[PDB]
Design a protein around this motif. Structure first.
Motif: not given
Ligand SMILES: O=c1ncn(Cc2ccc(F)cc2F)c2ccc(Oc3ncccc3C(F)(F)F)cc12
Ligand SMILES: [Mg+2]
Ligand SMILES: [Mg+2]
Length: 559
Positions: A519-522, A417-420, A407-412, A465-468
């Motif tokens: 750096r990227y994920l958060f 997915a990002r917050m939780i 789910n993190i991969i498909m709904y990044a 990159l916009s995913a971040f």
């Protein structure tokens, strides 16, 4: 005929089954209303049996026959290759159900004498015996859900490991290439989530006045007839095939795919199946082709205008040219009656939609947010209830497949997915010092081994990159996420942000790949944003094989 016939013997479990979420000290941090989370068990098998057991009705017409010939014409261009025993064994998941003939998945993957010898005998038997129905095991599937204002277990039917490897030899290449050749852009499994969104948005924008609808077939597998399965085979037979592969497909079709005896975990005769088995290699491909055939023909019968289909197994979404409100509603109803005659009756009644974001297909929908520059960015999302319920379960118990990772991969790019998911699991992996341990997850049914630390590159390659940097999510999306959090007792935004800042700081202090994750994920958790540039490792990633075809129930492992 009847989709199933039952002897009276019960669908039994092969071990103790868990239905409730454990009072785990780590799951509570994710969601507090644990009594709302449950896992299906064999105790609900009879409720499912009753729902999927019925006499099928099927009336084929000229439109159906016309579409079928069009499909076979495209299939005629395909040349399929036979896989060697070695290649097929390699596609077997490490923890695939062991054979009752003295060997297991590990032996198959290692090409042990006993495994290979038996597999060879099963293959030779497929070449020699064109009639004997192949035995299959029926089990109640264990899946996690959140209670609704409960779902009975699904029934999974699969043959012995030896037979599964043979299926791969004869049909792996076919089911991985033919759907695309026949359905082209309408084949959903060729798209990554970002590409699916692209196809949906472009398709929607190509209509003068777009109208679309998702079509839910009531228990699709049970609606698949013997006729449907032989039609499916007729399509495969148009491929250029090695003599032995041609015989194997013919034999498997009559001895396994069209139906056969059902045996429970205790070895008791449970009954007989005359419909689609969920646990065979051709299920995804077969359902996709069948759904596409019926829907494409139904659209012609219904007189829908310029229909564009997107099919993923039994999941269907159609986008067409609107003929006006009343006309569309009438055409949709005519479409449904045609699908019903083709033995594809509706579960949830279909409804025309004039807003793309409101159409849910493959349990997901297109939504929009904005990147750092303020530009609109389309992305795929979904109601987070099931993903969160399963994330809680996987936090409390050890599970072979980690749906949270998939789910993190498909709904990044999604808010949830990002917050939780990212915050919750990276926190746990840090605490347990397991950041570099590879984990298994599934993408379109196939199993993959993935390193958590490689997520930044994976996400950049698949989502950009916009995913971040996405922010300013839609009012509809925010409301859905918020409602889910209240329902499940998930901590609010502020709590996740505080946890994220802490996790980020820890990841940064570790340097290396961990720091990249921080750096990227958060980056969303801090005010002093970091300029996120292209990750070098991202341009060196080949995830192409990740989105080629569907393999749910196919017992496939991609290394
Ligand atoms: O549109 C947004 N744009 C930006 N942020 C920041 C943000 C936080 C976490 C994340 F990973 C990505 C983000 F960009 C939001 C943070 C929360 C939010 O949604 C909510 N707003 C108020 C109350 C409740 C919620 C919700 F339950 F989370 F939906 C919407 C947005
Ligand atoms: Mg592809
Ligand atoms: Mg359905």
């Amino acid at each position: 005929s009847m989709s199933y016939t039952w002897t009276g013997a019960l669908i039994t479990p092969c071990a103790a089954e868990e239905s409730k979420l454990p009072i785990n000290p780590l799951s509570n941090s994710l969601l507090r209303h644990h009594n709302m989370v449950y896992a299906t068990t064999s105790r609900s098998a009879s409720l499912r049996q009753k729902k999927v057991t019925f006499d099928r009705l099927q009336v084929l017409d000229d439109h159906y026959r016309d579409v079928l010939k069009e499909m076979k014409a495209k299939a005629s261009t395909v040349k399929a290759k036979l896989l060697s025993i070695e290649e097929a064994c390699k596609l077997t998941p490490p923890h695939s159900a062991k054979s009752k003939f003295g060997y297991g998945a590990k032996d198959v993957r290692n090409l042990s004498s006993r495994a290979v010898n038996h597999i060879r005998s099963v293959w030779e038997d497929l070449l020699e015996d064109t009639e004997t129905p192949i035995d299959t095991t029926i089990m109640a599937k264990s899946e996690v859900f959140c209670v609704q204002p409960r779902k009975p277990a699904r029934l999974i039917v699969f043959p012995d490991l030896g037979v599964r490897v043979c299926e791969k030899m004869a049909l792996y290449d076919v089911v991985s290439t033919l759907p695309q050749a026949v359905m082209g852009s309408s084949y959903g499994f060729q798209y990554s989530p970002k590409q699916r969104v692209e196809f949906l948005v472009n398709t929607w924008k190509s209509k003068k006045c777009p109208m679309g609808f998702s079509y839910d077939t009531r228990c699709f597998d049970s609606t698949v007839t013997e006729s449907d399965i032989r039609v499916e085979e007729s399509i495969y037979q148009c491929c250029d095939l090695a003599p032995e592969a041609r015989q194997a497909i013919r034999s498997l079709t009559e001895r396994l795919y069209i139906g056969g005896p059902l045996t429970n975990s205790k070895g008791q005769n449970c009954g007989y199946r005359r419909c689609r088995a969920s646990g065979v290699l051709t299920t995804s491909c077969g359902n996709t082709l069948t759904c596409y055939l019926k829907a494409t023909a139904a659209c012609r019968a219904a007189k829908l205008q310029d229909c564009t289909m997107l099919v993923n197994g039994d999941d269907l979404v159609v986008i067409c040219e609107s003929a006006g409100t009343q006309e569309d509603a009438a055409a949709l109803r005519a479409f449904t009656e045609a699908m019903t005659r083709y033995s594809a009756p509706p579960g949830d009644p279909p409804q025309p939609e004039y807003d793309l974001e409101l159409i849910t297909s493959c349990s997901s929908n297109v939504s929009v947010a904005h990147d750092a520059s303020g530009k609109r960015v389309y992305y795929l999302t979904r109601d987070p209830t099931t993903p969160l319920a399963r994330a809680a379960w996987e936090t409390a118990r050890h599970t072979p497949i980690n749906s949270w990772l998939g789910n993190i991969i498909m709904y990044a790019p999604t808010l949830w997915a990002r917050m939780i998911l990212m915050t919750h699991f990276f926190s746990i992996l840090l605490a347990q010092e397991q950041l570099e341990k590879a984990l298994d997850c599934q993408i379109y049914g196939a199993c993959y081994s993935i390193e958590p630390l490689d997520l930044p590159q994976i996400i950049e390659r698949l989502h950009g990159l916009s995913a971040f940097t996405l922010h300013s999510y839609s009012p509809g999306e925010i409301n859905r996420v918020a409602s889910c959090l209240r329902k499940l007792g998930v901590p609010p935004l502020r709590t996740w942000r505080h946890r994220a800042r802490s996790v980020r700081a820890k990841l940064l202090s570790q340097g290396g790949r961990a720091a990249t994750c921080g750096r990227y994920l958060f980056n969303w958790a801090v005010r002093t944003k970091l300029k996120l540039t292209p990750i070098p490792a991202a341009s060196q990633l080949d995830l192409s094989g990740w989105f080629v075809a569907g393999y749910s129930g196919g017992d496939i492992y991609h290394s």
